[PDB]
CSV table of N, CA and C in Angstrom, one decimal:
chain,number,residue,atom,x,y,z
A,1,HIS,N,105.4,-25.8,-40.3
A,1,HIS,CA,104.3,-24.8,-40.3
A,1,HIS,C,104.5,-23.8,-41.4
A,2,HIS,N,105.7,-23.2,-41.5
A,2,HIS,CA,106.1,-22.3,-42.6
A,2,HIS,C,106.1,-23.1,-43.9
A,3,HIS,N,105.5,-22.6,-45.0
A,3,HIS,CA,105.4,-23.3,-46.3
A,3,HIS,C,106.5,-22.7,-47.1
A,4,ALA,N,107.7,-23.4,-47.1
A,4,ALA,CA,108.9,-22.9,-47.8
A,4,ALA,C,108.8,-23.1,-49.3
A,5,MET,N,109.5,-22.3,-50.0
A,5,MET,CA,109.9,-22.7,-51.4
A,5,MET,C,110.7,-23.9,-51.3
A,6,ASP,N,110.5,-24.8,-52.2
A,6,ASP,CA,111.4,-26.0,-52.4
A,6,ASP,C,111.9,-26.1,-53.8
A,7,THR,N,113.1,-26.6,-53.9
A,7,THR,CA,113.7,-26.8,-55.2
A,7,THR,C,113.2,-28.0,-55.9
A,8,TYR,N,112.7,-27.9,-57.1
A,8,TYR,CA,112.3,-29.0,-58.0
A,8,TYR,C,113.3,-29.0,-59.2
A,9,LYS,N,113.6,-30.2,-59.6
A,9,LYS,CA,114.5,-30.4,-60.8
A,9,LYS,C,113.7,-30.9,-61.9
A,10,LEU,N,114.2,-30.6,-63.1
A,10,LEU,CA,113.7,-31.1,-64.4
A,10,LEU,C,114.8,-31.7,-65.2
A,11,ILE,N,114.8,-33.0,-65.4
A,11,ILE,CA,115.7,-33.6,-66.3
A,11,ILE,C,115.1,-33.7,-67.7
A,12,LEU,N,115.8,-33.1,-68.7
A,12,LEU,CA,115.3,-33.0,-70.0
A,12,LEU,C,116.0,-34.1,-70.9
A,13,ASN,N,115.1,-34.9,-71.5
A,13,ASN,CA,115.6,-36.0,-72.4
A,13,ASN,C,114.7,-36.0,-73.6
A,14,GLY,N,114.5,-34.8,-74.1
A,14,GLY,CA,113.7,-34.6,-75.3
A,14,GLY,C,114.5,-34.8,-76.6
A,15,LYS,N,113.8,-34.8,-77.7
A,15,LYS,CA,114.5,-35.0,-79.0
A,15,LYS,C,115.6,-33.9,-79.3
A,16,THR,N,115.2,-32.7,-78.9
A,16,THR,CA,116.0,-31.5,-79.3
A,16,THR,C,116.4,-30.7,-78.1
A,17,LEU,N,116.0,-31.1,-76.9
A,17,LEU,CA,116.3,-30.4,-75.6
A,17,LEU,C,116.7,-31.3,-74.6
A,18,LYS,N,118.0,-31.2,-74.1
A,18,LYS,CA,118.5,-32.1,-73.1
A,18,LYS,C,119.2,-31.4,-72.0
A,19,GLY,N,119.3,-32.0,-70.8
A,19,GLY,CA,120.1,-31.5,-69.7
A,19,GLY,C,119.3,-31.4,-68.5
A,20,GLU,N,119.4,-30.3,-67.7
A,20,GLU,CA,118.7,-30.2,-66.4
A,20,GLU,C,118.4,-28.8,-66.2
A,21,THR,N,117.3,-28.5,-65.6
A,21,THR,CA,116.9,-27.2,-65.1
A,21,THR,C,116.2,-27.3,-63.8
A,22,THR,N,115.8,-26.2,-63.2
A,22,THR,CA,115.3,-26.2,-61.8
A,22,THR,C,114.2,-25.1,-61.7
A,23,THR,N,113.4,-25.2,-60.6
A,23,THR,CA,112.5,-24.1,-60.3
A,23,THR,C,112.3,-24.2,-58.8
A,24,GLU,N,111.6,-23.1,-58.2
A,24,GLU,CA,111.2,-23.1,-56.8
A,24,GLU,C,109.7,-23.0,-56.8
A,25,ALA,N,109.0,-23.8,-55.9
A,25,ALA,CA,107.6,-23.6,-55.7
A,25,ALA,C,107.3,-24.2,-54.4
A,26,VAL,N,106.0,-23.9,-53.9
A,26,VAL,CA,105.7,-24.5,-52.6
A,26,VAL,C,105.3,-25.9,-52.7
A,27,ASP,N,104.9,-26.4,-53.9
A,27,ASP,CA,104.5,-27.8,-54.0
A,27,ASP,C,104.8,-28.3,-55.4
A,28,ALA,N,104.7,-29.6,-55.6
A,28,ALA,CA,105.0,-30.3,-56.8
A,28,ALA,C,104.1,-30.0,-57.9
A,29,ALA,N,102.8,-29.9,-57.6
A,29,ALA,CA,101.8,-29.6,-58.7
A,29,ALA,C,102.1,-28.3,-59.4
A,30,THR,N,102.5,-27.2,-58.6
A,30,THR,CA,102.9,-26.0,-59.2
A,30,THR,C,104.2,-26.1,-60.0
A,31,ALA,N,105.2,-26.8,-59.5
A,31,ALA,CA,106.4,-27.0,-60.2
A,31,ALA,C,106.1,-27.7,-61.6
A,32,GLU,N,105.2,-28.7,-61.5
A,32,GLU,CA,104.9,-29.4,-62.8
A,32,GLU,C,104.3,-28.4,-63.8
A,33,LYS,N,103.4,-27.5,-63.4
A,33,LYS,CA,102.9,-26.5,-64.4
A,33,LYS,C,104.0,-25.7,-65.0
A,34,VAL,N,104.9,-25.2,-64.1
A,34,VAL,CA,106.0,-24.4,-64.6
A,34,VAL,C,106.9,-25.1,-65.6
A,35,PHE,N,107.2,-26.4,-65.3
A,35,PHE,CA,108.1,-27.2,-66.1
A,35,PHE,C,107.4,-27.6,-67.4
A,36,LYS,N,106.1,-27.9,-67.4
A,36,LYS,CA,105.4,-28.2,-68.6
A,36,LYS,C,105.3,-27.0,-69.5
A,37,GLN,N,105.1,-25.8,-69.0
A,37,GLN,CA,105.0,-24.7,-69.8
A,37,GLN,C,106.4,-24.4,-70.5
A,38,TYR,N,107.4,-24.5,-69.7
A,38,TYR,CA,108.8,-24.4,-70.2
A,38,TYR,C,109.1,-25.4,-71.4
A,39,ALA,N,108.7,-26.7,-71.1
A,39,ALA,CA,109.0,-27.7,-72.1
A,39,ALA,C,108.2,-27.4,-73.4
A,40,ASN,N,106.9,-27.1,-73.2
A,40,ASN,CA,106.0,-26.8,-74.4
A,40,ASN,C,106.5,-25.6,-75.2
A,41,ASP,N,107.0,-24.5,-74.5
A,41,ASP,CA,107.5,-23.3,-75.1
A,41,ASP,C,108.7,-23.7,-76.0
A,42,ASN,N,109.4,-24.7,-75.6
A,42,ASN,CA,110.6,-25.2,-76.4
A,42,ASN,C,110.4,-26.4,-77.3
A,43,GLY,N,109.1,-26.6,-77.6
A,43,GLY,CA,108.7,-27.7,-78.6
A,43,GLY,C,108.9,-29.1,-78.1
A,44,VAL,N,109.0,-29.3,-76.8
A,44,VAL,CA,109.1,-30.6,-76.2
A,44,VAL,C,107.8,-31.3,-76.2
A,45,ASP,N,107.7,-32.6,-76.6
A,45,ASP,CA,106.5,-33.4,-76.6
A,45,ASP,C,106.9,-34.8,-76.1
A,46,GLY,N,106.8,-35.0,-74.8
A,46,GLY,CA,107.3,-36.2,-74.2
A,46,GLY,C,106.5,-36.8,-73.1
A,47,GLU,N,107.0,-37.9,-72.5
A,47,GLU,CA,106.4,-38.6,-71.4
A,47,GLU,C,107.1,-38.1,-70.1
A,48,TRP,N,106.3,-38.0,-69.0
A,48,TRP,CA,106.8,-37.4,-67.8
A,48,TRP,C,106.7,-38.4,-66.6
A,49,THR,N,107.8,-38.3,-65.8
A,49,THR,CA,107.8,-38.9,-64.5
A,49,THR,C,108.0,-37.9,-63.4
A,50,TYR,N,107.6,-38.2,-62.2
A,50,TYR,CA,107.9,-37.4,-61.0
A,50,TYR,C,108.4,-38.3,-59.9
A,51,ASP,N,109.5,-38.0,-59.3
A,51,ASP,CA,110.1,-38.7,-58.3
A,51,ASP,C,110.0,-37.9,-57.0
A,52,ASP,N,109.1,-38.3,-56.1
A,52,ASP,CA,108.9,-37.6,-54.8
A,52,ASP,C,110.0,-37.6,-53.9
A,53,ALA,N,110.9,-38.6,-53.9
A,53,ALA,CA,112.0,-38.8,-53.0
A,53,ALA,C,113.1,-37.7,-53.3
A,54,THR,N,113.2,-37.3,-54.6
A,54,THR,CA,114.3,-36.4,-55.0
A,54,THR,C,113.7,-35.1,-55.5
A,55,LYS,N,112.4,-34.9,-55.6
A,55,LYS,CA,111.8,-33.8,-56.1
A,55,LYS,C,112.2,-33.5,-57.6
A,56,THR,N,112.2,-34.5,-58.4
A,56,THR,CA,112.7,-34.4,-59.8
A,56,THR,C,111.6,-34.9,-60.8
A,57,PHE,N,111.4,-34.1,-61.8
A,57,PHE,CA,110.6,-34.5,-62.9
A,57,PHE,C,111.6,-34.8,-64.0
A,58,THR,N,111.2,-35.8,-64.9
A,58,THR,CA,111.9,-36.1,-66.1
A,58,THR,C,110.9,-36.1,-67.3
A,59,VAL,N,111.4,-35.6,-68.4
A,59,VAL,CA,110.6,-35.7,-69.6
A,59,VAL,C,111.4,-36.3,-70.7
A,60,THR,N,110.9,-37.4,-71.3
A,60,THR,CA,111.6,-38.2,-72.2
A,60,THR,C,110.9,-38.3,-73.5
A,61,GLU,N,111.6,-38.2,-74.6
A,61,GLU,CA,111.1,-38.3,-76.0
A,61,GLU,C,109.9,-37.4,-76.2
């Protein structure tokens, strides 16, 4: 019933930015917006996956 913050992860596999970061949001759609803005701010231009089982986004190339 309570809509908790949940931890979402971002695995970075860009040309110039690699590793992992995280955010908190109530849902995946919001986390995606946060992570895409972060990636774009850092010049990342890649392909994205989302894994619902692990709450993890990945951006590659």
